[PDB]
Write an enzyme that holds these catalytic residues in place. Sequence first.
Site, PDB file in Angstrom:
ATOM      1  N   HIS A  23      -3.059   1.247   4.109  1.00 51.00           N
ATOM      2  CA  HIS A  23      -2.339   0.988   5.281  1.00 51.00           C
ATOM      3  C   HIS A  23      -0.242   0.682   5.150  1.00 51.00           C
ATOM      4  O   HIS A  23      -0.592  -0.493   5.138  1.00 51.00           O
ATOM      5  CB  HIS A  23      -3.012   0.220   6.333  1.00 51.00           C
ATOM      6  CG  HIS A  23      -2.682   0.168   7.584  1.00 51.00           C
ATOM      7  ND1 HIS A  23      -2.381   1.537   8.225  1.00 51.00           N
ATOM      8  CD2 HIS A  23      -1.870  -1.020   8.099  1.00 51.00           C
ATOM      9  CE1 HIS A  23      -2.295   1.257   9.588  1.00 51.00           C
ATOM     10  NE2 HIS A  23      -2.057  -0.230   9.371  1.00 51.00           N
TER      11      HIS A  23
ATOM     12  N   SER B 111       0.926   2.104  12.496  1.00 55.73           N
ATOM     13  CA  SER B 111       0.242   1.431  13.551  1.00 55.73           C
ATOM     14  C   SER B 111       0.328   0.856  14.532  1.00 55.73           C
ATOM     15  O   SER B 111       0.057   2.405  15.133  1.00 55.73           O
ATOM     16  CB  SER B 111       0.200   0.484  11.944  1.00 55.73           C
ATOM     17  OG  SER B 111      -1.059  -0.614  11.815  1.00 55.73           O
TER      18      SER B 111
ATOM     19  N   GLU C  94      -6.797   3.147   4.759  1.00 57.92           N
ATOM     20  CA  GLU C  94      -6.096   2.453   5.751  1.00 57.92           C
ATOM     21  C   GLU C  94      -7.032   1.124   5.980  1.00 57.92           C
ATOM     22  O   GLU C  94      -6.298   0.407   6.151  1.00 57.92           O
ATOM     23  CB  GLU C  94      -6.875   3.544   7.394  1.00 57.92           C
ATOM     24  CG  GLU C  94      -5.473   4.767   6.585  1.00 57.92           C
ATOM     25  CD  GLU C  94      -4.068   4.467   7.063  1.00 57.92           C
ATOM     26  OE1 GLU C  94      -3.827   3.392   7.055  1.00 57.92           O
ATOM     27  OE2 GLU C  94      -3.627   5.163   7.495  1.00 57.92           O
TER      28      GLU C  94
HETATM   29  O1  LIG Z   1      -0.282  -3.418  10.591  1.00 56.80           O
HETATM   30  N1  LIG Z   1      -0.586  -4.241   9.775  1.00 56.80           N
HETATM   31  C1  LIG Z   1      -1.626  -5.644  10.258  1.00 56.80           C
HETATM   32  C2  LIG Z   1      -1.616  -6.095   9.532  1.00 56.80           C
HETATM   33  N2  LIG Z   1      -3.091  -6.607   9.482  1.00 56.80           N
HETATM   34  C3  LIG Z   1      -3.839  -7.696   9.029  1.00 56.80           C
HETATM   35  C4  LIG Z   1      -4.891  -8.834   9.350  1.00 56.80           C
HETATM   36  C5  LIG Z   1      -4.449 -10.561   8.548  1.00 56.80           C
HETATM   37  C6  LIG Z   1      -4.580 -11.346   9.888  1.00 56.80           C
HETATM   38  C7  LIG Z   1      -5.125 -12.884   9.461  1.00 56.80           C
HETATM   39  C8  LIG Z   1      -5.821 -13.200  10.908  1.00 56.80           C
HETATM   40  N3  LIG Z   1      -6.082 -14.804  10.449  1.00 56.80           N
HETATM   41  C9  LIG Z   1      -6.688 -14.964  11.064  1.00 56.80           C
HETATM   42  C10 LIG Z   1      -7.748 -16.815  11.249  1.00 56.80           C
HETATM   43  O2  LIG Z   1      -6.246 -16.897  11.199  1.00 56.80           O
HETATM   44  C11 LIG Z   1      -5.424 -17.264  10.448  1.00 56.80           C
HETATM   45  C12 LIG Z   1      -4.818 -15.544  10.283  1.00 56.80           C
HETATM   46  C13 LIG Z   1      -4.455  -6.864   7.495  1.00 56.80           C
HETATM   47  C14 LIG Z   1      -3.140  -5.859   7.148  1.00 56.80           C
HETATM   48  C15 LIG Z   1      -2.625  -5.540   7.997  1.00 56.80           C
HETATM   49  O3  LIG Z   1      -1.734  -4.456   7.279  1.00 56.80           O
END
Ligand SMILES: O/N=C/c1nc(CCCCCN2CCOCC2)ccc1O
Lengths: 532, 532
Positions: free
Chosen positions: B437, B197, B324
Amino acid sequence: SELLVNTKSGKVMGTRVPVLSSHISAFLGIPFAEPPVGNMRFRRPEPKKPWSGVWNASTYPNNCQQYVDEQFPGFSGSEMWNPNREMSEDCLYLNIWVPSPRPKSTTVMVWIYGGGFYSGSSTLDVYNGKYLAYTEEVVLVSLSYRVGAFGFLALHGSQEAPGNVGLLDQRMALQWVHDNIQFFGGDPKTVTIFGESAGGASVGMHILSPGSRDLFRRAILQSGSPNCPWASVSVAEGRRRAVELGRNLNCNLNSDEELIHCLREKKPQELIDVEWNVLPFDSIFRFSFVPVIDGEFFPTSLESMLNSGNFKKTQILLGVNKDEGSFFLLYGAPGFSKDSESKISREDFMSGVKLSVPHANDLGLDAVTLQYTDWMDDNNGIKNRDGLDDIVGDHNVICPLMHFVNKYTKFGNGTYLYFFNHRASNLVWPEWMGVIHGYEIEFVFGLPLVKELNYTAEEEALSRRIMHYWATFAKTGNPNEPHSQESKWPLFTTKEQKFIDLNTEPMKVHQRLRVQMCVFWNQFLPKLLNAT
Amino acid sequence: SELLVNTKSGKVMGTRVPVLSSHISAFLGIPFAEPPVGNMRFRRPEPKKPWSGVWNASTYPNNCQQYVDEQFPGFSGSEMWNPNREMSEDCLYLNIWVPSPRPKSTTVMVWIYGGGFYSGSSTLDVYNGKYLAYTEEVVLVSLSYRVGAFGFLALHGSQEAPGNVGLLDQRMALQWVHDNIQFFGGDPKTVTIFGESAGGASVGMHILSPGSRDLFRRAILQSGSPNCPWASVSVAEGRRRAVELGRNLNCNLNSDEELIHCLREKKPQELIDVEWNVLPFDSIFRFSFVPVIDGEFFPTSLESMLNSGNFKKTQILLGVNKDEGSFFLLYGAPGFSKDSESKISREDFMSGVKLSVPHANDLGLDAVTLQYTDWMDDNNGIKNRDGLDDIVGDHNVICPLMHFVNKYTKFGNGTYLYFFNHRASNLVWPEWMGVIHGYEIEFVFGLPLVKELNYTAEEEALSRRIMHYWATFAKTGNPNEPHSQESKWPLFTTKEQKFIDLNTEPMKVHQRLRVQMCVFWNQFLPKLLNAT
Ligand SMILES: O/N=C/c1nc(CCCCCN2CCOCC2)ccc1O
Ligand SMILES: O/N=C/c1nc(CCCCCN2CCOCC2)ccc1O
Ligand SMILES: *[C@@H]1O[C@H](CO)[C@@H](O)[C@H](O)[C@H]1NC(C)=O
Ligand SMILES: *[C@@H]1O[C@H](CO)[C@@H](O)[C@H](O)[C@H]1NC(C)=O
Ligand SMILES: *[C@@H]1O[C@H](CO)[C@@H](O)[C@H](O)[C@H]1NC(C)=O
Ligand SMILES: *[C@@H]1O[C@H](CO)[C@@H](O)[C@H](O)[C@H]1NC(C)=O
């Protein structure tokens, strides 16, 4: 006498013609308008002055003046569509086949020929009404109308060359059938108009035009619809092409009066020699002089008429063929040839896309190219050939028809939709062209019933089926026989969008004909072009 | 002693750790930079001052300050990714696993963790280097780097907060491995960097950056590539988000000096509390503080660097997973839930498209929607769910990676491409999320070799295969054993574009991974957006 008929315009004498080891009456070359010659060229038709004596209706009339296909001399595939009668501007006649003995009040079907509004004849072997009239006991009419500049030169604002006069030729024939078919045993309150290609678009145009709606009961459209991209131009484009035509003939262009008078002095072949030079783009499936959105024959744009329900509400039977595009690629796209498999190189494919969507910008060409390219196998010459085939037919025939059928069914009183995908066993065109534009007509007119024409028994059965679907629809508004044990052709509805295949196999019902590509052609691409 | 190592920075004392009924040496929490605390927050890292005495390297270090996932408290699927050590700005450490007895000069692999540049830890159970180091007899390194604003706040022109300092954290760890791994038995001329990633994008970024190229031999990128739409922002967008961050914390915004000083006074959690508020769009798969195209770490734009061959030329091993996108839809798209099948309504699908391509205009959203909608079955909630899944993964991972691999192979010295599509038998996430992912990592690090973790025997075989592919590639630049009888992983070439599946079934070779959709994402849609 059975061959003598008294009409509001005068008496006519038909002829007894053999058909399938029997006989019926034919009334060929009845005039329905004054000859649109001389100072009347480009004008609205006038009704035929009634005549004294007996009009000899034993022989086919002249065909209208048109470009003649010489691309394959002696080849029956192309020449069966050419005029088979002398050409003349004196060509506004109709032909009637009448069962024997003469019926009292029977279902009437009026055939309108196709040919891109630049060509066509009521007298072609493949339009011979005697098999349909005899087999189904209908009164079969075929009309004629001016094509080319003679029918569609449009100088909006002028009353000498207003445009659309070929459509008014058709309407006057319809008026004549309404006024006179009762004397031939036809029922004027059960008239079905049907046509293919430009004739199918014509049928749709009489459905839309308020001046035409009252002259027929129901409608059949084959491989054509009024909203087709080639079937009409704006008033400004019609004027531009008319002026460009006069520019090709060294005409004074100072005024409409100057231009029209110059064009009226020219011999017919002079107009035909240069007719193709006025197209604005390097294109295929585009014709020079076509109907014009004039605010008169068509009160507003076609799309707004379809959206508001501004059109005749009745039953319609319509359909398309599997490979509508191949004819036009053969004649105008690089890499296509009558005598090879026409495997298409990538360069040639790109050239084909540009000829096919001549109004598209480069982003639009890319959208089309992406939509029709298998990128796992981009150099497949067969996939490029069939892909171009589909592009031309989807864009010019299928998807406009699907747009029409979906707008119409919202307000109409019954829709039946077909997909004709039988390749005839005696077809003289190459394999790669598939189920060709226009090659359902011979089944609609019952040619496979004639043994000498070398069809299979299964093809005769398919023709009889189609003839009976069509005549039953003309008679009742439903192609199915009531309380019949044969497989039923379901109604097309907004919700289910059902249609049938037409071929020699047992009927199959499908839904949402080519919906993926038609969303691209009817929704996405017009949006893309209007934004860029 | 085997657990004592003398480095250029000082002596370190490791610990003997059990692994698969044997033992190896671990050197945990070695510092490679000065703690980037206080007035050094947001600054480029400084090298660690050498120390007297023996550094106790028996325990894992702190993790960097980051947003912590609380979306599913107690649920191991999400919490196995959370920091498993106290958070601290004092977090620039690396960890080394060393075979026993100590090798003399062996292949080195350096792991760079992912997490959208906003999160990640070198200390996660799933990154435990002991299985890979033991099984394949490599020296396994995992580094750490600042994430969030602490690593990527970018006020271009300022030397106090230039941006990209988390990338420079990674580079300094690479410098340290180059300078010191020989003392651990590692061969500094055979260092493979690998990451997933954001860590895969990081690997690609060190391939591109002239300041990083000389510090490693070859590269592995898992589900990430430097050109990903989320992996970098322009200098103007980085400045805009930095200012918006200070605006969220009531900072004086008069000058960079004012802003930086205010942000340095804040406790770490204050920055994390508001970090997500600076995103410009309602989006998924977009992170606040990421690498910046600064003209220094990256000399020009990524695309022009890739086009001109301006990057390190070597061998690369890379790949993607089947699904993913599902992680990011679960966390941010309406209608997706951990405990239902997440069948997606048409409204919800449209909402998902807009969150997924947040930079697209309405024509662009239509292009995406058309490309991924089966219009024969538009209300299929499973097709809408899987369609959104594919949109997110194609746009954010697969198609950017395919663009990178195709540009790179033109100049590189050998490419190996994989499609990982095994769903693990002990997966705790729902079925609908598929091959998620990040869920190849546990196979890359050999977790299925541990019996207590409840994998199948076939999954242990797949893990051993992948570990050996990876280590063999790290050692030689080719994942295949020479003169081996097992099935061979073909080179990826410009002409043939071959890749393999990675799953428990016999290896299959395919070509042109998701080429249809990647032409849409890499060619057509950017053209559409730039014209409109
Ligand atoms: O490398 N992985 C990073 C990854 N990142 C995410 C995104 C989650 C982000 C959550 C953001 N939120 C936005 C609003 O406030 C609270 C947090 C989902 C799956 C993943 O695998
Ligand atoms: O309804 N059928 C009309 C129809 N029309 C075509 C197009 C042939 C047009 C040839 C035009 N060329 C243009 C150049 O000058 C010579 C004539 C091809 C197949 C068809 O079926
Ligand atoms: C009608 O015309 C045909 C062909 O010109 C002719 O054979 C026939 O005798 C004519 N009938 C008349 C003049 O009554
Ligand atoms: C057609 O119209 C009649 C009423 O005039 C109605 O009862 C019938 O259901 C309609 N049929 C269709 C197919 O809409
Ligand atoms: C290193 O740290 C661990 C845990 O804090 C401790 O158990 C060990 O004794 C230490 N070794 C030293 C101080 O030499
Ligand atoms: C890599 O480079 C060497 C020369 O340094 C060359 O002989 C070899 O063919 C190259 N391999 C690939 C896969 O390009």
